[PDB]
């Protein structure tokens, strides 16, 4: 057993998150803990965006995720951006993270990431895509997965409930059903972060006049929408 | 190896960090930090028992920028490294973006450096807690606490030290019993008076004008009060 | 307590290799190195332990051949002799050699060796360098094996009214009396420094002749 | 250790040979299985130039970098002094970088040892030198580097003498390995033998044996 | 020397170097374990440690260390003086250092083994006192438990305090009352200002210092004995935190209260191991080797032993306890299934009940009899022996009675659970706990029988006093302890083996269908509660394969 | 295992590395610091070994003609303070201010206590770099006379003390420190009336005077 | 048997406070032979007694710094060496940017500070090496530890059984301190210093070495036919 191993224990003891692709888009879902009522919750975000159609959850060492959202930015703009003119494609923004944490692993005198990415994306010529990339620095494209510590049952649940038909409103349920099976503590709008890539917004996108300018699919729920959503389960 | 160098334990452990979070206990001041509806205070302990000191240079309570204000547990050596740190980037974000450092944006900066240091192995982490407060343009009054750990994030109220258990029990209930984010109390004085009152209560100690160090920061500026303004406070405290 | 006991580990180099042996007369410095017993069709004459430095100054050594040592001692004496357009020094030489092997002290670098040479200030002079980044000015030194009985037969031979003839005479005594005799040509190697001649390595043949005039001395 | 099992790695490399004659050098393969492909084959005697042959003995990856660097050498010489490299110059060469490799730690500096024959340029003096870890390079009129090494070394020794080497080179070809052969030639002459003439020197070896024990047994 | 070690080594305890401490409680143990901690000063002897024990100390040692022997060292009478009667007199600075050193110790941490032996430490040395110093002892040790700057981390050592409290209840059980009133009310208080209000399900949080004494309880009620018939108010009291605690890591703990209540009714166990008794026939001058070498540590009256033997009066209060707390559970999760709900308070509670049922069942194992539906090592079982004296007590039957109505009601739980909470998984873990409870406690306790406690480990003290080729160089606390590990073994010699009932085969086939489910985290300790069912069962195996 | 390396926590949160330095700083010899009124006074021991000039072996040294200041490391120290005060008045063209050179020596100190590959300062200003404004300040190996003395002075004298008389208090009480021991006193002086706020060393007829009656205490 | 844990390098405090390898270091001077160094008011000697056998030649003890300043030595040569070598350096560069000869003081000031590096460093070594400096005319005397120490004395000795040329010193202080004018005898005294210092050894031309500098001389070192008490 190395330090890679120890990373895999690490995010092992993390919160769950999951990750659940249909055939027109990708929800990602999380539980935000913060045993302090005096602590802001709104503060503190577990899904960050990393491009307008790509966007990235966690399990594990959350500082480390922070820091791995901002060099996943940058990179997303200084390698593939300012030379085509575009955002990158899901697969090769992930294989730059995956890039970046087997160098962290590799390099002398640094430890490896604690963390687990669940990411997910869209593009042309691909469609959508939802992709698991560990510690070590392997990226894994999938269905329907789930990370962290009650991540068997939620994976045994997701296995049961994946098909083929399956619609963003079916995963968006299907995912609340398995953070609802699996909350550490209080299960409310507040306490749940959910994002989804879907069809693009044009009211998100802040000006018109440019028809060929189309608004993001990245799309966090607000926590109105979330208890709304909880109320038909 | 992994007791003495921040490296993963076989149990995924970081036995580094928390002797930092150990360490950040060595000095017995609690500091407690609340906001008002247009003010932040921050209240700290102060213990001069050499009779050789000078009161006036020993303070945790330092002033990063005009609004900005920080007051940190743990070793005064580490606190004035952050301190002359949090001062540097504050001014580079001035200069380079043309305006105002937010406070949580100094508060994720100082979280950033600390997971660096988390995560190389030739830098030790900083046994110190770094709570910032300000009064911000878009957010108004806001408190942000890091950790050696990296970790960081706002709060209504807050309190550090080896005795915060108490100070965090006790503004859990009044916060419960307000059913609110804040103090309604429209000046600064009193929201002093509250913070004051509520640190005497936890702690079961009366203090003096030369026991506590307080920072108050509004729309203007953040500063510190003076010990006569802790004893005007002290005064109109024992007239109710 | 603590020393630096690799330096003296070094130092014991009483088994580094074969035999070297200088003497330094008032008529040119002779040094003797044993030639090992190879292959009948090896070319013996790739075997070389006592090298040139400059045409007044020569080597011997008693390690590996495997080489930095002595191409800085070259590249020093070239670059003096470009800048100052004389000849250098042999003691300044030899503390190029060991100034090198400082700078390149708790750790031993490189193998000891025996620099001979002539210059108009000090006529002939003979130095060990040690891999200590040290030397020593010697009348006649012996390294190797069987160096300490060596260095008692020079300490008791060495009478500074030598020639050039009995320097070698005493060299290949000495050399055939480590080895244990039936040292005939290809057991020994000679060479010489003068101030007229500079540094010159003997042939076969002068080896040999010279072996019989020491047979021949030994019969009386 | 580290050079001494640099050795014990050369020792369980293919054999290889090395005979210089009056004006020709003769540089001296496993068993290929049934699915190998023998078209493309690097051959063990490399060239590192028109005058001058290598054949390693010992870890062919690591001689594959040997080779190269001697070839780049060779080039670099040619190119800065207008004159192609010597014979000794280039096992000096040779030998300084192994003795490089040596140090620094040296887990395994190459693990493999060389055979640099061929002649001078100007020049029809056969020369050959055997080149081995830690930089010591030294002359040979025949060697041998491989499994056997001390047979094949003393069979040589036996037959081949150091006060008439073979005029022809014929003979010098003309020896019995108990195959690969390269001849060397002055004016930058290199030629390779093919199979059909290693097999015809094998079926004279054999009917000479066969003639010898029919006149004695 | 032996005392003023005993001192320089209580006080060099750190909080850093773990290897030093376990060093230095392995010497504190060996002092402890072979002198009487007492006062051997007479009436009148006007004699001090500092001007007799230290200028004798200091002048035999500058006479060693200056490069002579022992032999030449003459003294007089006076090193009599010098000995015990002054030398025993630093005992009670000795405690209070220790007590200090300790609650120091809560807050570091600490591997599990130096946590034993630490506790080992402790007992040893409050069973080496007399009855002054013990009595001083237990009132500085409640002194500073109720007052001391402790327990500020988030994972503290508690067991290095609420253990040896309970040890001093083992010895002196008329303490307990009064203590354990305190420990309710201060419970009480912590849950008024809001403790275990927030549901933390992977952890605890440092708002819960009310587990404290959640913990101390537990000890305390382990070792009451005959000094709890206070039981009205101790069954209010668990009725109320059972009803007023929701929280999965706190329900947990506080299930345990039940089970050291009716444990502690219960159970055959010895209560005094002490070095020497108080009553002793030896003189105060052979006292100093715990007679280790002497014949008369083998003799009859040195060894009279104190044992706890339950009586009709506690056999009748576990049984009313056991009868009380299983309908109330029944009562709560019939009503609680009468209205099933989705949300985590439903569930919770669920286990929660569930947790009690299993630790009633637990607690009261020892009145359970295996050969009920239908032997040499007779054990001290309370309703008798044969079958004759058995039928004729109508408590026995209505034990037996309630055991059927509690595991009728876990196949209504079951048969509840899989019909409408399948994707649950919590739920089914504490189901499948419970069942393993109700097979493996047919009239042995084997949950808690492996876990540390506040009794003299047998194989510590073992390896502290053996010495090979020499038959037993031991102490009274060692024979004690040898003599409760006998029992305690012929109690844990009974064969359960038996015919599988209607409830039981019902139970098996339920446990079977556990066991081949989807979840790995609901199969697999069903995997291991159908191997000890399959172990307590005969033919099971049949049953299993077809 | 925790002691053995700097810039290493150990598990109550402490570095023993700088304890040992602090250690070692309480071996050396006394100096003493007293604030007067518009002025500070240094005072510092000098132990004689034997063939020793009694002149000219200064320990109190000058930063910036207006700061007063294992020995090798309080030089080292005090070179960084003054390139440090050079750096400020090169780029503000004002004399550094006590506070601000404080400060900066404080970062400095603390910068050798965050890598394991330097070596803590053992100097006296604490090893840890941590520092306070003092009315009176002791360290060396009489350190807690001097600091008795000093308190006995705070206490004595509420509304100040003059630089005249605290020259001579400064002598007595290290003379007061000494007598533990069975040696020279060096004092210096910065004040704004009698050395127009330019640190000075006071010699001659005042050190006379000062020595007379320290020996008459 | 009695092993330290806290002497492996000279980035480790000992629990007292000790530097174990700088006083190894300190050790390491007993090794070298023995220097004796005098000093009166207007004249400066330096006195020096090894050779490895009958057909070797002298170690050098004495090295020139400038033509008003040297040195003698004891202990590790090359860091002898690289010391001398950086004093001439700073006295090149005193002598070159400001026409100011090298005051003797401001030269042990920094070779203290020089020798003060490679005591915190890790994995270096501190120097190992004792030196005895002496300057021009006033006179003066310094003595210099590894340890980044220096003394200005009037006179002392080290190495190699040098207790007894400091006793005798010590002694005859107020004898030698006011010789001024003559040199020859201050060099006498100093002979006989370090006579004091030799177990029955004879002094010849071989084994001996002397150094002078005052005013209006130059630093001058004798040896050879030259130590023959002239």
Same mark, same amino acid.
């Not at chain 1, 503190?44 to 500082?63: E, H, N, Q, R």
């Not at chain 1, 009211?203 to 018109?208: E, F, P, R």
């Given at each position: ?8 224990? *690490? ?10 692709? #249909? ?63 575009? %955002? ?146 | ?240 | ?29 002779? $040094? ?43 590249? *020093? ?110 057991? #020994? ?32 | 250790?580290?050079?001494? %099992? ?94 490089? %490799? ?25 020369? $050959? ?89 | ?252 703990? !506080? ?126 079982? %309370? ?164 | ?47 004689? !070994? ?60 603390? *910068? ?12 006296? $200003? ?49 003379? $007061? ?36 009656? #320290?020996?008459?205490? | ?117 490679? !005591? ?111």
């Amino acid at each position: 057993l190395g330090q890679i191993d120890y990373a895999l224990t *690490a995010v092992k003891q993390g919160v769950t998150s999951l990750g659940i692709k #249909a055939t027109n888009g990708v929800v990602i879902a999380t539980e935000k803990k913060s045993s302090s009522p005096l602590a802001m919750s709104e503060t503190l975000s577990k899904v960050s965006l990393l491009t307008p159609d790509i966007g990235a959850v966690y399990s594990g060492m959350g500082p480390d995720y922070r820091v791995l959202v901002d060099k996943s930015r940058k990179v997303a703009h200084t390698s593939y951006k300012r030379i085509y003119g575009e %955002y990158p494609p899901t697969k090769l923004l992930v294989s730059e993270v995956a890039k970046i944490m087997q160098e962290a692993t590799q390099s002398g005198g640094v430890r490896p990431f604690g963390v687990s990415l669940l990411i997910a994306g869209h593009d042309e010529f691909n469609g959508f895509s939802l992709y698991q990339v560990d510690p070590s620095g392997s990226y894994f494209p999938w269905k329907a997965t789930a990370i962290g510590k009650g991540s068997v049952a939620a994976k045994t649940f997701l296995e049961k409930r994946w098909n083929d038909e399956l619609e963003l409103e079916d995963a968006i349920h299907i995912a609340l059903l398995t953070l609802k099976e699996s909350v550490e503590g209080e299960f409310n709008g507040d306490t749940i972060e959910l994002a989804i890539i879907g069809d693009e917004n044009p009211d998100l996108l802040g000006y018109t006049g440019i028809p060929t300018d189309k608004g993001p699919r990245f799309r966090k729920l607000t926590s109105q929408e979330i208890n709304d959503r909880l109320e038909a389960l | 190896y992994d007791r003495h160098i921040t490296i993963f334990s076989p149990e995924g452990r970081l036995y580094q960090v928390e002797y930092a979070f150990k360490a950040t206990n060595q000095t017995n001041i609690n500091s407690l930090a609340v906001r008002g509806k247009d003010c932040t205070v921050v209240i700290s302990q102060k213990k001069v028992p050499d009779k050789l000191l000078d009161p006036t240079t020993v303070s945790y309570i330092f002033c990063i920028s005009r609004t900005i204000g920080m007051v940190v547990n743990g070793p005064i050596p580490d606190a004035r490294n952050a301190a002359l740190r949090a001062k540097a980037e504050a001014a580079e974000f001035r200069y380079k973006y043309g305006y105002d450092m937010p406070c949580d944006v100094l508060a994720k900066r100082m979280a950033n450096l600390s997971q660096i240091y988390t995560q190389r192995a030739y830098m030790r982490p900083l046994g110190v807690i770094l709570t910032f407060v300000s009064v911000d343009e878009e957010l108004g009054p806001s408190i942000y606490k890091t950790d050696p750990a990296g970790y960081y994030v706002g709060y209504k109220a807050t309190a550090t030290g080896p005795k915060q258990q108490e100070i965090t029990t006790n503004l859990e209930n009044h916060f419960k019993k307000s059913k609110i984010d804040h103090i309604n109390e429209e000046s600064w004085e009193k929201v002093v008076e509250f913070a004051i009152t509520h640190m005497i209560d936890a702690l079961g100690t009366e203090f003096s004008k030369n026991d506590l160090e307080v920072g108050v920061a509004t729309k203007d500026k953040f500063f510190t009060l003076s010990a006569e303004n802790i004893e005007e406070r002290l005064v109109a405290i024992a007239e109710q | 307590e603590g020393r630096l006991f690799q330096v003296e580990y070094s130092l014991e180099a009483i088994k580094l290799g074969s035999t070297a042996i200088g003497i330094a007369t008032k008529e040119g410095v002779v $040094l003797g190195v044993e030639k090992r017993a190879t292959s009948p069709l090896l070319e013996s004459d790739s075997i070389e332990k006592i090298v040139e430095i400059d045409r007044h100054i020569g080597c011997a050594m008693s390690g590996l051949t495997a080489r930095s040592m002595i191409e800085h001692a070259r590249t *020093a004496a070239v670059t003096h002799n470009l800048y100052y357009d004389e000849d250098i020094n042999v003691e300044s030489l030899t503390q190029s050699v060991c100034d090198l092997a400082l700078r390149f002290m708790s750790r031993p670098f490189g193998v000891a060796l025996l620099i001979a040479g002539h210059d108009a200030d000090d006529g002939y002079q003979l130095f060990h360098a040690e891999p200590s980044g040290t030397f020593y000015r010697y009348n006649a030194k012996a390294i190797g094996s069987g160096s300490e009985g060596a260095q008692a037969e020079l300490l008791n031979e060495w009478h500074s009214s030598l020639t050039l003839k009995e320097a070698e005479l005493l060299v290949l005594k000495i050399l055939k009396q480590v080895m244990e005799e039936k040292l005939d040509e290809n057991n #020994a190697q000679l060479s010489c420094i003068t101030k007229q001649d500079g540094f010159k390595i003997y042939d076969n043949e002068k080896t040999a002749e010279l072996i019989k005039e020491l047979k021949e001395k030994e019969a009386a | 250790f580290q050079v001494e %099992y640099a050795l014990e790695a050369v020792k369980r490399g293919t054999c290889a040979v090395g005979v210089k004659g009056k004006n020709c050098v003769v540089l001296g393969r496993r068993s290929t299985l049934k699915l190998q492909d023998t078209r493309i084959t690097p051959s063990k005697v490399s060239k590192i130039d028109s005058h001058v042959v290598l054949s390693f003995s010992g870890l062919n990856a690591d001689s594959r970098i040997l080779i190269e660097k001697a070839r780049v050498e060779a080039q670099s010489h040619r190119l800065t002094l207008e004159d192609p490299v010597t014979v000794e110059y280039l096992t000096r060469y040779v030998a300084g970088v192994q003795q490089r %490799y040596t140090q620094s730690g040296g887990v395994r500096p190459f693990g493999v040892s060389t055979l640099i024959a061929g002649f001078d340029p100007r020049d029809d003096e056969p020369k $050959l030198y055997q080149t081995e870890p830690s930089g010591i390079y030294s002359s040979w009129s025949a060697q041998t580097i491989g499994r056997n090494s001390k047979t094949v070394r003393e069979f040589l020794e036996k037959n081949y003498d150091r006060k008439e080497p073979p005029a022809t080179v014929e003979e010098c070809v003309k020896l019995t390995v108990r195959i690969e052969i390269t001849v060397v030639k002055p004016d930058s002459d290199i030629v390779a033998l093919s199979s059909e003439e290693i097999n015809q020197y094998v079926t004279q070896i054999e009917q000479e044996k066969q003639e010898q024990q029919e006149q004695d047994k | 020397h032996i005392t003023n070690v005993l001192s320089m080594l209580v006080s060099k305890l750190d909080m850093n170097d773990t290897n030093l401490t376990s060093n230095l409680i392995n010497g504190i143990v060996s002092i402890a374990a072979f002198i009487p901690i007492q006062d051997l000063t007479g009436e009148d002897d006007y004699i001090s440690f500092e001007s007799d024990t230290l200028p004798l100390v200091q002048q035999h040692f500058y006479h060693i260390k200056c490069g002579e022997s022992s032999k030449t060292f003459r003294v007089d009478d006076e090193l009599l003086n010098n000995a015990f009667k002054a030398s025993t007199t630093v005992f009670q600075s000795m405690l209070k250092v220790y007590v200090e050193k300790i609650f120091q110790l809560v807050d570091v941490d600490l591997e599990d083994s130096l946590v034993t032996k630490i506790n080992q430490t402790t007992m040893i040395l409050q069973e080496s006192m007399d009855d002054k110093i013990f009595n001083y002892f237990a009132s500085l040790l409640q002194r500073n438990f109720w007052s001391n700057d402790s327990f500020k981390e988030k994972d503290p050592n508690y067991e290095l305090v609420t253990i040896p409290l309970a040890a001093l209840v083992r010895r002196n059980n008329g303490l307990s009352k009064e203590l354990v009133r305190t420990l309710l009310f201060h419970i009480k208080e912590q849950i008024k200002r809001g403790a275990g209000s927030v549901r933390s399900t992977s952890e605890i949080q440092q708002r819960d210092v009310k587990l404290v004494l959640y913990l101390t309880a537990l000890n305390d009620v382990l070792r009451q004995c005959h000094e709890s018939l206070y039981s009205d108010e101790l069954i209010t009291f668990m009725k109320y935190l059972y009803d007023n605690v929701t929280n999965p890591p706190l329900d947990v703990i !506080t299930s345990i209260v039940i089970h050291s209540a009716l444990a502690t009714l219960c159970t055959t166990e010895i209560t005094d191991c002490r070095l020497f008794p108080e009553d002793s026939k030896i003189p105060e001058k052979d006292r100093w080797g715990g007679l280790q070498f002497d014949p008369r540590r083998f003799d009859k009256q040195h060894l009279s032993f104190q044992w706890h033997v339950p009586s009709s009066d506690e056999i009748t209060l576990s049984i009313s306890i056991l009868e009380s707390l299983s309908e109330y559970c029944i009562n709560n999760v019939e009503e609680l299934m009468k209205a099933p709900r989705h949300d985590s308070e439903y569930g919770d509670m669920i286990q929660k009940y569930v947790l009690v049922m299993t630790h009633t069942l637990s607690g009261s194992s020892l009145l359970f009899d295996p050969d009920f539906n239908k032997d040499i090592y007779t054990c001290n079982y %309370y309703f008798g022996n044969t079958t004759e004296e058995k039928l004729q007590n109508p408590q026995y039957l209505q034990v037996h009675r309630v055991r059927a109505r509690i595991g009728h009601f876990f196949h209504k739980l079951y048969v509840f659970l899989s019909t409408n909470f399948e994707n649950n998984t919590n739920m089914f873990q504490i189901l499948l706990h419970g069942l393993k409870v109700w097979f493996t406690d047919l009239g042995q306790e084997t949950v808690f029988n492996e876990d540390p406690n506040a009794f003299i480990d047998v194989d510590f003290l073992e390896n502290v006093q053996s010495l090979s080729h020499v038959n037993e160089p031991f102490t009274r606390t060692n024979f004690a302890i040898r003599a409760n590990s006998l029992h305690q073994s012929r109690v844990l010699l009974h064969s359960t083996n038996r015919k599988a009932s209607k409830l039981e085969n019902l139970l098996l086939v339920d446990i079977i269908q556990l066991a081949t489910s989807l979840y790995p985290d609901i199969y697999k300790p069903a995997q291991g509660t159908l191997v000890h069912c399959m172990k307590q069962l005969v033919g099971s195996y049949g049953v299993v394969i077809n | 295992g925790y002691d053995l390396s700097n810039s290493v926590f150990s598990p109550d949160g402490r570095n023993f590395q700088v304890e040992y330095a602090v250690k070692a700083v309480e071996n050396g010899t006394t100096s003493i610091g007293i604030k007067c009124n518009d002025g500070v006074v240094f005072a510092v021991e000098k132990l004689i !070994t034997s063939l020793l000039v009694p002149q000219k072996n200064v320990k109190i040294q000058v930063v910036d003609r207006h700061i007063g200041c294992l020995i090798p490391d309080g030089r080292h120290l005090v070179n960084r303070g003054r390139e440090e005060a050079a750096s400020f008045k090169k780029l503000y063209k004002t004399p550094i201010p006590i506070p601000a050179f404080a400060d900066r020596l404080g970062q400095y100190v603390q *910068a050798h206590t965050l890598y394991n590959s330097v070596r803590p300062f053992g100097v006296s $200003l604490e090893p840890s770099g941590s520092y306070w404004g003092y009315k009176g300040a002791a360290t060396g190996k009489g350190r807690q006379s001097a600091k008795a003395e000093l308190e006995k002075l705070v206490d004595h004298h509420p509304e100040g003390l003059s630089a005249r008389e605290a020259v001579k208090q400064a002598a007595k009480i290290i003379y $007061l420190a000494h007598e533990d021991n069975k040696f020279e006193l060096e004092i210096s002086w910065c004040s704004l009336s009698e050395t127009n706020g330019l640190h000075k060393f006071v010699k001659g007829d005042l050190l006379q005077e000062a020595i007379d009656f #320290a020996q008459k205490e | 048997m009695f092993r330290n844990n806290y002497d492996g390098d000279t980035v480790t405090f000992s629990p007292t406070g000790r530097l174990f390898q700088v006083e190894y270091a300190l050790e390491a001077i007993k090794q070298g032979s023995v220097t004796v160094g005098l000093r009166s008011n207007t004249h400066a000697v330096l006195v020096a007694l090894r050779n490895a056998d009958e057909l070797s030649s002298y170690q050098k003890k004495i090295i020139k710094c400038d033509e008003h300043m040297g040195l003698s030595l004891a202990g590790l040569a090359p860091d002898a060496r690289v010391l001398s070598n950086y004093l001439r350096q700073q006295c090149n560069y005193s002598s070159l940017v400001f026409n100011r000869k090298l005051a003797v003081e401001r030269a042990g000031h920094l070779l203290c500070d020089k020798a003060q590096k490679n !005591t915190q460093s890790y994995g270096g070594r501190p120097y190992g090496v004792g030196l005895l400096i002496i300057g021009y005319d006033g006179a003066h005397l310094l003595e210099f530890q590894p340890s980044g120490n220096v003394t200005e004395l009037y006179g002392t000795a080290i190495g190699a059984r040098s207790q007894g040329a400091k006793t005798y010193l010590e002694r005859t202080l107020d004898t030698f301190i006011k010789i001024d004018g003559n040199p020859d005898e201050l060099i006498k005294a100093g002979v006989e210093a370090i006579s004091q210092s030799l177990r029955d050894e004879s002094l010849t031309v071989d084994n001996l070495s002397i150094a002078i500098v005052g005013k209006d001389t130059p630093f001058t070192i004798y040896d050879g036919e030259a130590v023959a008490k002239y």
